[PDB]
């Protein structure tokens, strides 16, 4: 035998779209083709983010796009996730590419003069990515993250799953 | 042309203690006993099915004639392999009658498809007939 | 089976050095500790107030805070299978400056002395000196020739045994 540190186990990185969605399966095929041929780090990033699970693809509201594109006028927002609508604040003019658009978010983006694009048009127009802004949504805002750990802890207590006789 | 088919082990992996007890059949089962002689791979009793016995991918599921088995039920199923008569051999299912077996055997001659059950359910025409 | 007292098994650890009892130096209370310095925690049993725990004795830590009477020292403590950071406030009596970077701080100054001449030799256009060679483990010694003029031989052989008694 050979004195190895550890034996070969599957690498914990997803290499394909999860689930049986036919359209998401093709997008991974499209960007897997672009990443291999163009060898652009943009396509490798989009391909990697297409394979994340639903909880690792957090939503991005229109207010986040509005703030992140204030100094990028002739640019395209590229978020590999659903784009929701922040009804509290107005939507300026901007181009957004996303997997999914909320019905109220798409109406607000289009009414302001912007365009809601999908990832097939973005690859057609900007395959390597030239006037794009990469955006991902916040991950620590999940209310499940509050209960992780020990609530008796002295530094960062958990949040005590509610149940019997919770005061 | 026909590749050399290599079988790494032609014996049967009979279940442990199947030769001593009639209640224990011969189909293989993993000995999970804590003190078992076979699962500890003692000398003498050290024969378990492992993936290392797997036959070559090129000649796996290959019949001794060099073809593959394609089960057929009527004359239309022969048309599914007429384009690969050098790869597949017909095999009439066990429940197909003797009358339909004549049509499958006759049609397979036309399409040059080898049939492995060509002598099955033949009528009384053996002796004096 | 030992007890679990705060100062268990400290007969020889907390004993003062031989012929070293009484008051300490004044350089102990006059040394200037700044944040980021390297210090050595040394439990002085002559001062019972603020005595650091015996597990920190002889450990090298870093100054992270300076208070009017105590110095904040930061050390790494080994726990079940992890390492935690311990932040103590120790009076200057129980700490001592560490020379753990004495050689390194000289090498830092040696290269900066050469770098100072380099920025001046570049103005004059002359070639600039190289940085000091890095430290290496004892290298295999090269071939050397030994003159036979001042050489003398002494035979080395096993010795006849002689009874000590």
């Amino acid at each position: 035998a050979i004195d190895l540190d550890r034996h070969h186990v599957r690498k914990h990185v997803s290499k394909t779209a999860r689930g049986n969605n036919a359209y998401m399966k093709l997008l991974v095929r499209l960007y897997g083709f672009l990443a291999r041929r163009t060898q652009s780090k943009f396509a490798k990033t989009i391909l990697h983010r297409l394979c994340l699970s639903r909880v690792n693809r957090p939503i991005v509201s229109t207010s986040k796009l509005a703030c992140l594109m204030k100094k990028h006028p002739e640019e395209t927002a590229v978020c590999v996730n659903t784009v929701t609508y922040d009804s509290r604040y107005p939507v300026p003019k901007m181009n957004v590419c996303a997997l999914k658009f909320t019905k109220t978010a798409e109406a607000a983006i289009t009414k302001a003069g912007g365009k809601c694009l999908r990832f097939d048009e973005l690859a057609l127009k900007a395959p390597t990515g030239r006037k794009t802004v990469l955006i991902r949504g916040k991950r620590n805002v999940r209310e499940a993250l509050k209960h992780f750990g020990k609530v008796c802890a002295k530094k960062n207590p958990a949040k005590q799953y509610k149940g019997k006789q919770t005061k | 042309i026909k590749p050399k088919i290599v079988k790494k082990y032609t014996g049967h992996f009979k279940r442990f203690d199947s030769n001593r007890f009639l209640r224990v059949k011969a189909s293989w089962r993993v000995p999970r006993g804590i003190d078992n002689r076979l699962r500890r791979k003692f000398k003498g009793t050290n024969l378990l099915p492992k993936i290392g016995y797997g036959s070559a991918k090129a000649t796996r599921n290959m019949l001794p004639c060099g073809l593959y088995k394609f089960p057929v039920r009527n004359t239309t199923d022969l048309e599914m392999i007429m384009m690969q008569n050098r790869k597949y051999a017909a095999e009439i299912s066990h429940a197909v009658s003797a009358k339909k077996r004549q049509e499958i055997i006759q049609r397979a001659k036309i399409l040059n498809i080898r049939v492995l059950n060509a002598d099955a359910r033949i009528k009384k025409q053996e002796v004096a007939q | 089976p030992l007890s679990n007292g705060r100062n268990r098994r400290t007969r020889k650890l907390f004993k003062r050095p031989f012929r070293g009892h009484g008051l300490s130096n004044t350089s102990t209370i006059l040394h200037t500790y700044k944040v980021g310095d390297y210090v050595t925690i040394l439990c002085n049993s002559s001062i019972q107030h603020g005595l650091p725990y015996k597990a920190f004795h002889g450990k090298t830590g870093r100054v992270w805070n300076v208070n009017p009477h105590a110095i904040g020292v930061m050390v790494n403590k080994k726990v079940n299978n992890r390492i935690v950071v311990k932040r103590l406030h120790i009076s200057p009596e129980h700490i001592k400056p560490s020379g753990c970077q004495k050689d390194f701080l000289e090498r830092k100054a040696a290269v900066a002395a050469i770098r100072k001449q380099n920025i001046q030799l570049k103005k004059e256009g002359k070639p600039l000196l190289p940085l000091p060679a890095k430290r290496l483990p004892k290298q295999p010694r090269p071939a050397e020739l030994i003159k036979g003029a001042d050489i003398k031989f002494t035979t080395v052989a096993p010795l006849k045994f002689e009874e000590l008694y």
């Binding site: - | - | 904040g72 950071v85 932040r87």
Partner: protein, 60 residues
């Protein structure tokens, strides 16, 4: 029914499988417990710098 009381056997092998976890860099940069005046001095400058940065944003 006496039993063995204790043993450190296999304990070091266990502790080195997933080896001694070092603390992150952010563990050494904590500020809680620092000098009161130094915290007062640092907060004053940070407030001054931030307020000066914000008036520039309003200007432009």
């Amino acid at each position: 029914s006496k039993d063995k009381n204790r043993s450190s056997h296999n304990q070091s092998h266990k502790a080195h499988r997933n080896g001694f976890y070092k603390p992150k860099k952010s563990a050494y940069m904590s500020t809680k417990g620092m000098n009161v005046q130094v915290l007062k001095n640092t907060k004053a400058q940070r407030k001054f710098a931030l307020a000066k940065k914000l008036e520039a944003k309003k200007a432009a």
